Amino acid sequence: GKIQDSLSSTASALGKLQNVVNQNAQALNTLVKQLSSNFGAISSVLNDILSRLDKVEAEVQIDRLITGRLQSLQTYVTQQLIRAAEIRASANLAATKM
Amino acid sequence: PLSETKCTLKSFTVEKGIYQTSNFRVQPTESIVRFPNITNLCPFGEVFNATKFASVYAWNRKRISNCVADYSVLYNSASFSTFKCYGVSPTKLNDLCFTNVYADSFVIRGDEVRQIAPGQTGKIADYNYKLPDDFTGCVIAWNSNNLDSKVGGNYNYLYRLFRKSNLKPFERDISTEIYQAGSTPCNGVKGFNCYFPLQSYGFQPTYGVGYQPYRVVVLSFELLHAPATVCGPKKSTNLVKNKCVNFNFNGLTGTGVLTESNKKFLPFQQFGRDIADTTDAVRDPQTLEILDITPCSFGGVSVITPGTNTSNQVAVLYQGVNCTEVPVAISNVFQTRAGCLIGAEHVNNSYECDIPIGAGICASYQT
Amino acid sequence: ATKFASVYAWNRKRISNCVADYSVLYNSASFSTFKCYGVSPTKLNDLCF
Amino acid sequence: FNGLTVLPPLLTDEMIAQYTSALLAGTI
Amino acid sequence: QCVNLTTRTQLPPAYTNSFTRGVYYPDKVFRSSVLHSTQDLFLPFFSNVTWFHAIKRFDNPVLPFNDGVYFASIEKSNIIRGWIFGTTLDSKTQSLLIVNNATNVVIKVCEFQFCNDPFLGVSNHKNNKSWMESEFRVYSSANNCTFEYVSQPFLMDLEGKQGNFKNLREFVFKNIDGYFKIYSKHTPINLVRDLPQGFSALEPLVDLPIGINITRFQTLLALSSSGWTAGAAAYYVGYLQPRTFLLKYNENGTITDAVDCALD
Ligand SMILES: *[C@@H]1O[C@H](CO)[C@@H](O[C@@H]2O[C@H](CO)[C@@H](O)[C@H](O)[C@H]2NC(C)=O)[C@H](O)[C@H]1NC(C)=O
Ligand SMILES: *[C@@H]1O[C@H](CO)[C@@H](O[C@@H]2O[C@H](CO)[C@@H](O)[C@H](O)[C@H]2NC(C)=O)[C@H](O)[C@H]1NC(C)=O
Ligand SMILES: *[C@@H]1O[C@H](CO)[C@@H](O[C@@H]2O[C@H](CO)[C@@H](O)[C@H](O)[C@H]2NC(C)=O)[C@H](O)[C@H]1NC(C)=O
Ligand SMILES: *[C@@H]1O[C@H](CO)[C@@H](O[C@@H]2O[C@H](CO)[C@@H](O)[C@H](O)[C@H]2NC(C)=O)[C@H](O)[C@H]1NC(C)=O
Ligand SMILES: *[C@@H]1O[C@H](CO)[C@@H](O[C@@H]2O[C@H](CO)[C@@H](O)[C@H](O)[C@H]2NC(C)=O)[C@H](O)[C@H]1NC(C)=O
Ligand SMILES: *[C@@H]1O[C@H](CO)[C@@H](O)[C@H](O)[C@H]1NC(C)=O
Ligand SMILES: *[C@@H]1O[C@H](CO)[C@@H](O)[C@H](O)[C@H]1NC(C)=O
Ligand SMILES: *[C@@H]1O[C@H](CO)[C@@H](O)[C@H](O)[C@H]1NC(C)=O
Ligand SMILES: *[C@@H]1O[C@H](CO)[C@@H](O)[C@H](O)[C@H]1NC(C)=O
Ligand SMILES: *[C@@H]1O[C@H](CO)[C@@H](O)[C@H](O)[C@H]1NC(C)=O
Ligand SMILES: *[C@@H]1O[C@H](CO)[C@@H](O)[C@H](O)[C@H]1NC(C)=O
Numbered sequence: 001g002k003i004q005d006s007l008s009s010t011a012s013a014l015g016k017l018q019n020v021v022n023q024n025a026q027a028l029n030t031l032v033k034q035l036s037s038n039f040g041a042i043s044s045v046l047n048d049i050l051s052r053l054d055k056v057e058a059e060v061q062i063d064r065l066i067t068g069r070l071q072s073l074q075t076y077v078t079q080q081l082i083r084a085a086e087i088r089a090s091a092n093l094a095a096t097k098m
Numbered sequence: 099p100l101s102e103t104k105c106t107l108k109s110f111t112v113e114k115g116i117y118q119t120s121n122f123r124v125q126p127t128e129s130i131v132r133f134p135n136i137t138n139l140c141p142f143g144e145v146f147n148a149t150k151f152a153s154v155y156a157w158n159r160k161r162i163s164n165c166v167a168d169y170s171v172l173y174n175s176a177s178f179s180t181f182k183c184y185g186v187s188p189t190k191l192n193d194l195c196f197t198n199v200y201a202d203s204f205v206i207r208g209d210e211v212r213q214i215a216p217g218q219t220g221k222i223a224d225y226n227y228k229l230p231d232d233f234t235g236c237v238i239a240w241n242s243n244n245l246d247s248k249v250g251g252n253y254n255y256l257y258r259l260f261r262k263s264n265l266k267p268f269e270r271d272i273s274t275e276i277y278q279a280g281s282t283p284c285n286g287v288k289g290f291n292c293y294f295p296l297q298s299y300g301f302q303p304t305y306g307v308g309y310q311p312y313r314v315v316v317l318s319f320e321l322l323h324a325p326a327t328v329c330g331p332k333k334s335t336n337l338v339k340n341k342c343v344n345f346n347f348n349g350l351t352g353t354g355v356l357t358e359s360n361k362k363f364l365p366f367q368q369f370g371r372d373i374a375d376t377t378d379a380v381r382d383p384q385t386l387e388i389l390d391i392t393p394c395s396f397g398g399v400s401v402i403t404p405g406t407n408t409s410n411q412v413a414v415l416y417q418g419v420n421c422t423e424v425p426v427a428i429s430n431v432f433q434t435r436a437g438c439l440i441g442a443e444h445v446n447n448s449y450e451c452d453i454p455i456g457a458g459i460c461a462s463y464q465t
Numbered sequence: 466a467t468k469f470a471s472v473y474a475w476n477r478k479r480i481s482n483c484v485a486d487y488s489v490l491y492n493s494a495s496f497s498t499f500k501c502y503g504v505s506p507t508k509l510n511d512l513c514f
Numbered sequence: 515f516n517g518l519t520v521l522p523p524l525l526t527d528e529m530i531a532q533y534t535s536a537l538l539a540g541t542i
Numbered sequence: 543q544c545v546n547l548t549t550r551t552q553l554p555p556a557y558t559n560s561f562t563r564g565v566y567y568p569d570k571v572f573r574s575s576v577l578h579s580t581q582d583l584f585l586p587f588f589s590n591v592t593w594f595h596a597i598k599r600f601d602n603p604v605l606p607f608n609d610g611v612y613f614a615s616i617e618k619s620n621i622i623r624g625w626i627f628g629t630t631l632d633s634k635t636q637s638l639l640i641v642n643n644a645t646n647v648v649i650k651v652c653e654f655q656f657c658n659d660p661f662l663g664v665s666n667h668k669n670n671k672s673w674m675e676s677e678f679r680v681y682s683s684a685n686n687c688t689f690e691y692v693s694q695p696f697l698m699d700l701e702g703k704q705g706n707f708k709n710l711r712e713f714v715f716k717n718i719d720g721y722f723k724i725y726s727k728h729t730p731i732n733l734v735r736d737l738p739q740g741f742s743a744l745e746p747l748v749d750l751p752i753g754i755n756i757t758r759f760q761t762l763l764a765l766s767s768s769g770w771t772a773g774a775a776a777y778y779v780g781y782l783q784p785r786t787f788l789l790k791y792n793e794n795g796t797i798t799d800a801v802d803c804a805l806d
């Protein structure tokens with residue numbers, strides 16, 4: 001019954017699980033936010049530059065986007081690996097407890 | 099799909115498993131353009147045939163709005179000399195909507211045209227007229243020795259000769275106060291180290307090429323922060339809702355399905371965005387309803403196949419896609435929480451998992 | 466200088482131990498070509514070489 | 515919406531609940 | 543006509559604390575439930591603003607316009623009837639006139655030659671009931687002009703006598719590259735002498751392409767050359783700063799509350 005009440009007592013008792021779901025949402029929200037940045041380009045909408053510039057002048061402007069946007073995935077994906085390894089180590093600990 | 103999974107596994111035989119491929123997309127059925135009900139023509143004719151251009155030290159800026167423009171005539175006209183754009187494509191001017199249009203009128207020496215470009219340097223580019231570093235627009239100029247230059251000398255095209263400091267983009271000064279360039283303070287109207295800030299162009303038809311007056315027009319505008327006032331000669335087409343179309347609202351291109359929106363736009367608001375800071379709701383320029391924007395479904399294509407030797411039948415999965423999408427090939431269709439499934443016979447009696455599918459579904463090979 | 470040699474015998478005149486006023490060089494219109502590659506034209510008046 | 519996708523886990527919330535029930539059943 | 547109305551006793555100004563006002567939409571882009579942030583010239587929270595009051599009392603001095611000014615006034619009987627904007631205010635350079643007296647929100651851009659203490663004289667003070675512009679002393683000359691704007695004519699009510707103020711008037715003036723963006727919000731309140739407590743958004747009323755230099759500004763006060771009675775009216779002046787703000791958009795979409803980054 002105390003487990004019933006202790007769980008019912010504070011909403012932060014599940015911080016070991018809440019922080020996990022928060023962080024992937026945080027990383028995704030950070031990753032999504034990156035698309036709104038310009039990385040030095042004249043705009044942040046890849047469709048805009050295509051309509052705004054010709055074939056031979058835009059081809060360098062998308063190159064500005066393609067560097068930063070791709071580099072964000074490297075930062076995002078890698079940061080997912082370490083978290084994935086962290087969970088994998090924890091799961092094996094859980095399996096031993098299981 | 100069997101050939102696709104062979105190609106993506108780089109082998110002529112593939113083991114019994116589920117493999118991703120190129121993700122599914124819904125192609126746009128048609129293209130639609132939405133422009134305001136504007137029909138009167140922009141006064142570019144009078145802008146570019148203005149008889150008198152203001153002196154560069156007092157260069158005249160004229161606003162143009164709520165009109166229909168055709169820059170193709172200016173682009174293709176051979177009467178012009180240097181039509182250089184810096185922020186936009188000269189042929190792409192004619193399919194964009196502009197918030198505001200600046201017409202800058204001033205005449206310089208033809209040898210001085212190079213200094214009009216953004217980021218340039220020189221006495222004229224410092225204290226006669228200049229552009230910001232991020233100039234969006236084009237510059238156009240042409241020789242005018244035939245009319246502006248006079249045999250007695252067109253000295254009426256004055257310009258500033260002295261200035262204390264370099265002014266700011268799109269900034270003008272009119273005061274002709276005597277410049278105290280020297281160490282000593284000065285007053286009055288003349289004096290040594292007390293020089294009049296103005297000196298005048300001397301323009302005659304007898305001067306050689308490059309020195310003649312050039313009628314220069316500079317076009318400045320801004321995109322995607324204000325409601326459209328000047329639009330290209332594109333013709334509006336009828337709106338199609340809830341279908342994947344290549345829509346276009348005042349130059350805001352995109353790809354998705356357009357639906358009516360329940361979000362209350364204030365009269366000054368026309369562009370709607372999400373937590374992602376990307377367009378999701380636009381007010382139609384023709385009629386003032388609010389149109390929700392959403393890209394129609396795209397999802398992964400995970401081929402579910404047994405061993406190549408065991409069989410050649412393949413079950414195609416569309417990750418997170420409602421079956422109300424692509425038909426059959428490229429009467430046997432199943433719906434899963436993970437997406438739509440094609441090429442499998444859903445059954446009720448259960449067995450052990452062989453090929454993981456999603457949301458507790460598993461495929462297997464049996465009669 | 467009264468005489469300038471050609472491109473093969475381009476003369477070198479080392480300059481040192483003086484304060485240089487590049488602003489008057491910048492402002493004078495007698496110089497038709499004026500472009501800098503490693504520095505900014507306006508700020509020659511603020512550096513020491 | 516911009517290529518971001520969440521694929522559901524293979525095991526559903528019901529099955530893992532049944533797994534825990536099975537794990538608890540043998541335990542007691 | 544041109545008369546110096548120096549019917550005022552020399553009194554220093556006053557101050558009050560600008561709690562949560564001066565927050566306007568930074569862009570014409572709609573958002574919902576977004577905790578977006580932006581950097582722009584803004585009035586910092588909890589700022590002493592210069593306090594003026596008209597009662598006899600004719601406090602109409604010239605105020606500088608360094609980097610945007612936020613104005614507010616709790617209005618009754620529509621006492622305030624216009625504003626003056628410019629950089630020299632002696633017809634030497636370009637000048638701005640905004641007038642909303644009784645019928646027209648008229649905006650004119652000419653090198654006007656003004657009075658030393660410009661205003662609009664209103665006849666029929668303490669006689670047969672009416673209020674109409676008799677003495678047009680706002681300007682004298684109209685040498686050259688560059689722009690004008692005229693809103694739809696109307697007829698506002700300049701009548702009433704009450705014990706407390708019922709209407710609040712807010713206006714925000716700023717010139718970015720010469721655009722005189724206007725942000726306004728009218729709130730019916732019931733107070734006596736204090737700025738309202740609460741938060742309110744400032745929609746962009748009008749934005750004008752005037753593009754003229756501005757340094758100092760003035761307001762309009764409505765009323766034999768000397769001697770008349772004025773009603774109870776007060777207003778405040780605040781100054782914007784380049785301060786980053788946080789903005790809350792409710793799920794329907796509007797500014798719910800603002801957070802000053804550098805306040806504390
Ligand atoms: C896939 O889409 C269809 C239609 O777009 C959905 O069918 C709707 O189902 C709900 C309740 O299940 C009904 O109230 C609606 O009327 C149905 N739509 C239509 C147009 O009749 C279906 O639910 C979707 N798939 C899933 C898994 O939800
Ligand atoms: C209001 O008073 C001011 C002075 O306080 C007047 O300004 C003077 O005007 C005269 C004549 O135009 C000039 O000779 C003076 O030089 C001005 N004074 C200053 C300090 O410059 C102003 O004219 C008065 N206005 C009216 C309508 O009487
Ligand atoms: C706008 O006008 C103000 C004055 O109305 C200008 O400021 C003056 O600048 C000169 C020279 O820089 C000074 O001698 C004056 O004392 C200044 N007066 C004031 C009241 O500050 C300002 O330079 C003008 N700006 C533009 C862009 O025209
Ligand atoms: C502002 O208005 C004045 C008042 O007319 C203009 O001044 C005239 O300018 C022309 C142009 O050289 C002269 O021929 C007139 O003699 C001036 N008038 C007077 C009374 O001296 C002035 O030009 C206007 N401003 C602009 C930019 O045009
Ligand atoms: C939508 O905007 C309006 C702004 O007035 C608000 O909606 C009002 O909500 C109250 C409270 O239930 C209702 O009594 C009104 O009838 C609503 N008005 C309208 C026009 O719908 C509110 O700010 C926004 N809606 C929500 C749910 O926040
Ligand atoms: C506004 O657009 C509608 C829709 O095409 C059109 O019928 C109407 O004539 C337009 N207004 C004017 C003044 O032309
Ligand atoms: C200016 O007038 C000439 C007439 O000789 C015409 O050919 C030209 O098209 C005009 N320019 C514009 C921009 O209308
Ligand atoms: C496929 O299975 C058959 C027998 O069922 C076997 O002979 C064949 O070798 C298998 N394929 C491969 C690639 O091993
Ligand atoms: C599964 O059972 C449902 C009834 O619960 C029935 O309608 C359906 O036809 C059955 N499907 C198969 C493949 O047996
Ligand atoms: C505002 O200024 C006055 C005097 O200039 C000062 O007394 C007052 O304390 C200031 N405001 C605050 C909040 O301190
Ligand atoms: C009396 O009232 C009328 C209203 O029409 C007004 O015109 C007139 O000026 C008033 N009399 C005086 C002396 O003001």
